[PDB]
């Protein structure tokens, strides 16, 4: 219901990020749109998941010196060699994530401000995503002009 | 009217948990993956590392880049001549090539061996070269896999007590003999009414060989074998023997019948076993049976200061010649060792016997400035910690992992929207 | 003085979180109440520390292949061997800390929203956890119905 | 009216520090614990492991299973026979089980031995076969750490030079002799005015047996001894002597009295002592004082092949019955061995010597389908990486690491309040 | 353009947090003042920076136990070690650095209400660090009360 | 209007990446830097460790704490007396000091030995004291590394069966003899009619001394050394000889003429070699040309239960007096050791040769309560686990790490300005 929760949904329906509506003459029975062209958004996905490989690219950088000078191979040895990167590597997944799931969410964050201040203070926030605009002193081309939808 | 952004996802998206809250999406990129590998020889470090060669590593040779395997960039880091071979310049055969050999480096290529094979048709009185070689090359790589330098020491401190003896030759050692071991005679020694006395000589493993220094030394300690007392009586008295202890007087190597049997292959006469000890520096003590004696007179010269795992390289002719895979065996034995084998013959490119694609794709990996690790499997670059498959030992370097493809974590890509809180 | 900050108390005195009332006929003297019912917060409480356990079911997964064949222990190898173990341990706590400290604190901000769009823009935004009711256009079962208290 | 909600804490509430904020509450719950250790044996893999043991882990047995330590499904993955032992199967002493035992596994359980305890009463000359069991054992489980596989053999390739000699008999060895060592006598030697001449032998550690490689065998060189010179020249001459040289001539074992001292207890009269050396494969030779001579003629074939740390189990009889620790203080004075001990005595089911119930809840573990780890101090499952005190070497697998516990880390609960900023 | 972006500045220019303001009679040109005393930051930021340490002693204090008996180093072994090290504390460092990023601009958010519910709901949350005053109902030391400047 | 609070930043502003957000500042501080190190001697664990030592670590001293180069505190964790050195109460040469060293200890601190230069003068046919010196004081060397205690055993189990014989002295070794070896004669071999019986000798080295046990023994098999045959000849007849072997025969030091040459240095008559080798407990044999007989009579008792690497300390005298380094490259050339060296001479406060200010400066970290690591360039406490340079072994403990310092990571301060999202 706006922004620090996502819905889901069944059969066919697309998903994303959408544009919707409340009540009216009271009471209303809702009104979803069919997506902004959000493309503020597409250029930061795509700025995002490229950032990541600095940390990526860490990872990839370090590989420890060893020295066997044995005919057969250490198995054990080297699973648990490799078990114990493995490991290390699950942490920093976990921390790109977060690394991008907050700065993701900081820049949904970085979107709907642009929203809540070129209307404004018509917009009355009601907190992020989601806002309160009467029908008595904002309209339908004043409604076209701020949301883009 | 409440104006609001609502989130939502289909049957075909999913979650990622961080720490710091999680993710949804239906595609992932995998955030790393295997490292590719190339089979052959290669090094990690181009400025410290020593080949040491034959023919096929000459750039002297009339006839390269068609008589080589390797680029001139990287035959000028080989230590060849044609025709050589670690061997020979052990024992320098009448009218073979007698090749110093002296490199150092750590990392360490070994491409030769072939110019001593069954074709070299050596007689003078050889047991088994083939044996001989393979005990020959083994103490090799199993001190240079702990050594920095290696030099041939092509002449060793000696001395005979007796006097009146006089030195060897043979129809079947093209009438003269080995540069090494030295062989010495006496003439009057008549077994039917004179047997004379016992020779004795010694032999000094030097500290030091010009700028090489000396901790180990790889020689033969060379007896005879005959096929037994009847046999040898036709010559000597009693048991043969021929021994070598130390300074202190503890016994090495040799061999003395009047404690074991004989061993002799039936009617194969006289023979000699010349197996490989690796001794310290220092003076050495021999006793042999009056008639003859024999001497040590080369080695090759060590440093325990320190080596890679070494890489040696198939050395054998093409198919219209007698071969042998006495190094292979030798690498396969040995601690630290690595053998590098083509799957198909040798296939020359000026001769039969020199250039083949096969092997110049081998050895075309040093090469490069850029060969992170070195495994008997090949060697590998630094994409990534891992391999599809095991990177099989020896090896050395920023070595590689074995993991499951499906233990490899990924990360989010495509349309993704976060979460955060129980949303409830 | 409401959701980014705590304070304290002394003697006896339960801690939690409240209910509190500011001003009035110029100037109040403040009146807390004793707590909503707030029953959302101890399900999501009794869900997070729930989910931690992902991280502790793969800090407890792992343990290294190791070989001595010798009968004397290695006492400081065991040890140093401990303390690298407890070392990496330390951080992976440190961690579902701020995964609980922020996911936790961002769920008491998926609470203070639906304060905030229920009597709406009636409240006014003081932020989170704080608002601005005027007693001119919303009363006492007004305030009942909203605060829940 | 300006309306909040106020975070609020006690001297009951705690804070804690997280990497993104932190956090308030009066209780913790600790991230993790200990994991259990259980006392005995038992494997981490359960199909590469093998048993070697006796009627304790004989199914065949006709009373099976209170004759059995074991279950079934594990007495499964025993090599045992009722009544043998290792030992034995070494010598073959008159009238006992002669099981050839011969398994494969990485992970090795031996549970065997007490079928030779001095309750045998086996004398055959026997100098102190307590002793000869230990140094017997020790060379098997030194050998049995590094091998994968291994397989009694059987006969060994054999030949004496002297062809009037026979062979041996004794009333204290049942009016026969060993299965090994071979015993060879000349009937003619007379101290009093014949003393014969001296006997060669060789023999043969084969390369491998049947689908068993040996890279390493377990053998007896046996000699005798004797109070003196003047107790021996009643037999024989001079000194005794009985030598072992490889095939190079190097002396292994033996007794040659001629360069050290006697030592047969005081009117012992004749003893054999049989220590166990570690072979490579190969022929040795045999020389002996002409009337007498000893040859061995079984060993234990290991390969080199790799192998975990061993659990050597201890093999007594009850209390009534004369038993010995040799198995005991083999596996602790030898390298990556495990013992593993009773805190009672043996207590059987359906013998007094057979189904202890102590034992079978020891040997449980062998058992399950999840142990992880098997130290010297029993035996862990993955619960955590830490355990109360050390796991005790020899160890291996995912061995858990003793922490103490006021250093494990713990998670908030209860009541929980957030932090963030300065707050100021 | 007001807390959670940061913009640049060319030759000279001093640069942080100051003070700006918008339009007026329709339509306006901006006006950006020098600072206010800002000094509840300075003690917070010198806060925080003290606080790293925690942390940093931890890090200080993990030096694994070692024994090599041998005359001469094991130099890639050595260096494999110290590259390990050095790669794990990159991470720490990652870690501190977001402990603050999250926490200063967590107290950022931590003196922009300060200023949200002095003079309020005159202020009209424009988000953080931006708000909306008209000039009809507040006025000029009605905007020195509040703003410090 | 509009009114906001507008973050910037200028070309002297550099952001840093978190995870979790970024932030922006124009200057930073270091998170670590480099442990400084000190040179010299340390202890890392003061109640498990322990130093033998001499009149430069002697209280007793009638001139301490002028004749000393530690505090008291630290002589107390000493076993030195003034004039004391292991290799002296090896030998108890007459009229020297024969203190018996024992200790227990892992971190064992050596500090003496200068009590035997070439300055003491002593004779007693030497063939090289530092010599002699340099081989002993390694086997010590190489047997503390792996042992917790140590004890001087002084005197060892031993019988001749010569019963005619007699004991040695020498006007060179001050009309008497060592104490260890010990020197048996017979009057009556005459080379020239008589030529005696060889004397048979046997000795003990036992498996403990009083609290102390005994794995692990440091002796001398001492041999005499002529210029050649004929030189002995004039006391002996054939070879000269003298042998050792073990309770099964096999042999381990010596010098037996009869298979390896003389080697006396001319004219120098006859003198004496003491190489030091190790052996186990247990009864060792010995056979000698008959006149003379030489026997072990001290030993170096030690346990295999562990130690740290050690740490030898320079013990030469004042420029004035003649010293030697022998223990120096008995260090150096024994694993697990450390060498303490001064880079000046050594500065007396008592006498010139007792007191130097580098030395107690050297010694002072013995000390500290607080040392972590300890290497052979000196020794850290725990502030950070790097080092501007490497920490070079033989070393143990927490030891830290070389890294470049433009590794190091940093940390913001100064002004600093958060970031997060991509602001767009
Ligand atoms: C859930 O929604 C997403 C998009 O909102 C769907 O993804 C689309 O899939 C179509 C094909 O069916 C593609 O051509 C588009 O590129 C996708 N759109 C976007 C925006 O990514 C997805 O199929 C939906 N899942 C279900 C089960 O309906
Ligand atoms: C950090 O905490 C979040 C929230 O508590 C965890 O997210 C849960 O993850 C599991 C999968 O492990 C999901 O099934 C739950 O639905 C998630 N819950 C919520 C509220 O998001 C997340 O697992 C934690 N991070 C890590 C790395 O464990
Ligand atoms: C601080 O406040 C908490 C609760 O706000 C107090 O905890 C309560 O303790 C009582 C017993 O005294 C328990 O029966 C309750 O279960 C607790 N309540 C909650 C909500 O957890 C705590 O005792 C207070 N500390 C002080 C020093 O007053
Ligand atoms: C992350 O930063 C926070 C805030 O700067 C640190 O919290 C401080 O923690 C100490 C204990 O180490 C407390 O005494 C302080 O009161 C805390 N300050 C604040 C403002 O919360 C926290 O230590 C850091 N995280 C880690 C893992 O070190
Ligand atoms: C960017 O702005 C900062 C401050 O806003 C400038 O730093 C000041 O530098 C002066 C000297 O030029 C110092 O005396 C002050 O202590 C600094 N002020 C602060 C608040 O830190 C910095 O010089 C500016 N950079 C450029 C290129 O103009
Ligand atoms: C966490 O994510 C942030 C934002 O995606 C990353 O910040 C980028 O860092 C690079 C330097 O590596 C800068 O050049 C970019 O301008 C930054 N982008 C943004 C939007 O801040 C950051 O690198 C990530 N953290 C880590 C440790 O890699
Ligand atoms: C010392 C010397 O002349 N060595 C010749 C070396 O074997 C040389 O590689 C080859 O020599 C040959 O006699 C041979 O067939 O072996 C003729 C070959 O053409 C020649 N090949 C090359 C490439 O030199
Ligand atoms: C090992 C040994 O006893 N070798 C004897 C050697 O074959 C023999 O004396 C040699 O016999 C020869 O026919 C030969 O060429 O082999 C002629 C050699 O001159 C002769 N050599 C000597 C040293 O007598
Ligand atoms: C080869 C053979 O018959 N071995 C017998 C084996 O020792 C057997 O376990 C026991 O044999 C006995 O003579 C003995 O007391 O040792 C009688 C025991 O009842 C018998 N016990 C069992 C469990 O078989
Ligand atoms: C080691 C040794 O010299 N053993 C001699 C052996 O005891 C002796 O010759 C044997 O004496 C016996 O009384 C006995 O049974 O021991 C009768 C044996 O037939 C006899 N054996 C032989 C081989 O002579
Ligand atoms: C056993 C005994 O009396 N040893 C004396 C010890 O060397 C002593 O340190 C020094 O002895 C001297 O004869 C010497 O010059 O060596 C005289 C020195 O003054 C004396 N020095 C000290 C510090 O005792
Ligand atoms: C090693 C050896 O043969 N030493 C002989 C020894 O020097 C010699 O017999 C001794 O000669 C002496 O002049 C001396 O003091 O050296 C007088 C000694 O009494 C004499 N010692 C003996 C045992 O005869
Ligand atoms: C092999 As080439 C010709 O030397
Ligand atoms: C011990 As059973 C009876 O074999
Ligand atoms: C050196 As002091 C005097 O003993």
Same mark, same amino acid.
């Given at each position: 219901?706006?922004?620090?929760?996502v819905?889901?949904?069944?059969?066919?329906?697309?998903?994303?990020?959408?544009?919707?509506?409340?009540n009216?003459?009271?009471?209303?029975?809702?009104?979803?749109?069919?997506?902004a062209?959000?493309?503020?958004?597409?250029?930061?996905?795509?700025?995002?998941?490229?950032?990541?490989?600095?940390?990526?690219?860490?990872?990839?950088?370090?590989?420890?010196?060893?020295?066997?000078?044995?005919?057969?191979?250490?198995?054990?040895?080297?699973?648990?060699?490799?078990?114990?990167?493995?490991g290390?590597?699950?942490?920093?997944?976990?921390?790109?994530?977060?690394?991008?799931?907050?700065?993701?969410?900081?820049?949904?964050?970085?979107?709907?401000?642009?929203?809540?201040?070129?209307?404004?203070?018509?917009?009355?926030?009601?907190?992020?995503?989601?806002?309160?605009?009467?029908?008595?002193?904002?309209?339908?081309?004043?409604?076209?002009?701020?949301?883009?939808? | 009217?409440?104006?609001?952004?609502?989130? *939502?996802?289909?049957?075909?998206?999913?979650?990622?948990?961080?720490?710091?809250?999680?993710?949804?999406?239906?595609?992932?990129?995998?955030?790393?993956?295997?490292?590719?590998?190339?089979?052959?020889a290669?090094?990690?470090?181009?400025?410290?590392?020593?080949?040491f060669?034959?023919?096929?590593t000459?750039?002297?040779?009339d006839?390269?880049?068609?008589?080589?395997?390797?680029?001139?960039?990287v035959?000028?880091?080989?230590?060849?001549?044609?025709?050589?071979?670690?061997?020979?310049?052990?024992?320098?055969?009448?009218?073979?090539?007698?090749?110093?050999?002296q490199?150092?480096?750590?990392?360490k290529?070994?491409?030769?061996?072939?110019?001593?094979?069954?074709?070299?048709?050596?007689?003078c009185?050889?047991?088994?070269?083939t044996?001989?070689?393979?005990?020959?090359?083994? *103490?090799?790589?199993?001190?240079? *896999?702990?050594?920095?330098?290696?030099?041939?020491?092509?002449?060793?401190?000696?001395?005979?007590?007796?006097?009146?003896?006089?030195?060897?030759?043979?129809?079947?050692?093209?009438?003269?003999?080995?540069?090494?071991?030295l062989?010495?005679?006496?003439?009057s020694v008549?077994?039917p009414?004179?047997?004379? +006395?016992?020779?004795s000589?010694?032999?000094?493993?030097?500290?030091?060989?010009?700028?090489?220094?000396?901790n180990?030394?790889?020689?033969?300690?060379?007896?005879?074998?005959?096929?037994?007392?009847?046999?040898?009586?036709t010559?000597?008295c009693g048991?043969?023997?021929?021994?070598?202890?130390?300074?202190?007087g503890?016994?090495?190597?040799?061999?003395?019948?009047?404690?074991?049997?004989?061993?002799?292959?039936?009617?194969?006469?006289?023979?000699?076993?010349?197996?490989?000890?690796?001794?310290?520096?220092?003076?050495?003590?021999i006793?042999?049976?009056p008639?003859?004696?024999?001497?040590?007179?080369?080695?090759?010269?060590?440093?325990?200061?320190?080596?890679?795992?070494?890489?040696?390289?198939?050395?054998?002719?093409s198919?219209?010649?007698?071969?042998?895979?006495?190094?292979?065996?030798?690498?396969?034995?040995?601690?630290?060792?690595?053998?590098i084998?083509?799957? +198909?013959?040798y296939?020359?490119?000026?001769?039969?016997?020199?250039?083949?694609?096969?092997?110049?794709?081998?050895?075309?990996?040093?090469?490069?400035?850029?060969?992170?690790?070195?495994?008997?499997?090949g060697?590998?670059?630094?994409?990534?910690?891992?391999?599809?498959?095991?990177?099989?030992?020896?090896?050395?370097?920023?070595?590689?992992?074995?993991?499951?493809?499906?233990?490899?974590?990924?990360?989010?890509?495509?349309?993704?929207?976060?979460?955060?809180?129980?949303?409830?």
């Open positions: 219901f706006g922004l620090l929760f819905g889901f949904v069944a059969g066919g329906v697309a998903g994303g990020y959408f544009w919707g509506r409340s009216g003459g009271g009471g209303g029975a809702s009104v979803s749109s069919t997506q062209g959000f493309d503020k958004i597409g250029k930061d996905i795509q700025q995002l998941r490229n950032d990541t490989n600095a940390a990526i690219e860490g990872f990839n950088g370090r590989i420890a010196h060893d020295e066997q000078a044995i005919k057969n191979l250490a198995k054990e040895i080297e699973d648990a060699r490799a078990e114990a990167l493995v290390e590597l699950g942490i920093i997944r976990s921390l790109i994530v977060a690394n991008i799931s907050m700065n993701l969410k900081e820049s949904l964050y970085e979107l709907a401000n642009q929203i809540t201040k070129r209307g404004g203070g018509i917009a009355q926030e009601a907190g992020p995503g989601c806002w309160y605009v009467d029908s008595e002193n904002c309209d339908a081309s004043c409604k076209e002009y701020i949301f883009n939808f | 009217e409440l104006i609001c952004i609502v989130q *939502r996802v289909n049957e075909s998206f999913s979650l990622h948990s961080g720490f710091g809250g999680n993710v949804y999406s239906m595609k992932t990129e995998p955030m790393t993956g295997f490292t590719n590998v190339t089979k052959g290669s090094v990690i470090n181009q400025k410290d590392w020593i080949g060669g034959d023919s096929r000459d750039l002297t040779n006839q390269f880049p068609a008589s080589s395997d390797v680029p001139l960039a035959a000028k880091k080989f230590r060849s001549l044609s025709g050589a071979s670690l061997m020979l310049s052990a024992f320098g055969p009448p009218g073979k090539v007698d090749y110093l050999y490199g150092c480096g750590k990392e290529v070994f491409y030769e061996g072939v110019n001593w094979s069954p074709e070299a048709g050596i007689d009185f050889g047991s088994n070269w044996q001989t070689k393979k005990d020959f090359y083994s *103490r090799i790589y199993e001190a240079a *896999r702990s050594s920095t330098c290696m030099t041939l020491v092509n002449s060793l401190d000696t001395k005979i007590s007796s006097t009146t003896a006089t030195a060897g030759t043979a129809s079947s050692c093209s009438s003269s003999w080995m540069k090494s071991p062989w010495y005679a006496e003439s008549n077994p009414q004179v047997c004379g +006395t016992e020779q000589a010694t032999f000094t493993l030097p500290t030091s060989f010009g700028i090489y220094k000396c180990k030394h790889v020689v033969q300690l060379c007896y005879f074998v005959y096929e037994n007392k009847a046999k040898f009586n010559f000597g048991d043969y023997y021929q021994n070598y202890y130390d300074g202190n503890n016994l090495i190597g040799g061999m003395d019948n009047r404690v074991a049997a004989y061993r002799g292959i039936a009617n194969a006469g006289v023979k000699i076993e010349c197996p490989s000890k690796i001794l310290n520096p220092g003076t050495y003590s006793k042999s049976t008639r003859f004696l024999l001497v040590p007179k080369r080695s090759y010269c060590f440093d325990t200061d320190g080596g890679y795992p070494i890489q040696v390289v198939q050395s054998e002719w198919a219209s010649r007698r071969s042998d895979n006495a190094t292979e065996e030798a690498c396969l034995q040995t601690e630290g060792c690595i053998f084998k083509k799957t +198909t013959p296939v020359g490119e000026a001769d039969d016997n020199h250039g083949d694609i096969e092997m110049r794709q081998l050895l075309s990996g040093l090469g490069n400035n850029d060969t992170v690790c070195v495994s008997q499997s060697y590998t670059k630094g994409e990534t910690p891992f391999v599809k498959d095991y990177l099989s030992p020896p090896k050395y370097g920023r070595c590689q992992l074995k993991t499951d493809s499906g233990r490899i974590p990924t990360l989010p890509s495509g349309l993704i929207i976060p979460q955060a809180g129980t949303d409830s």
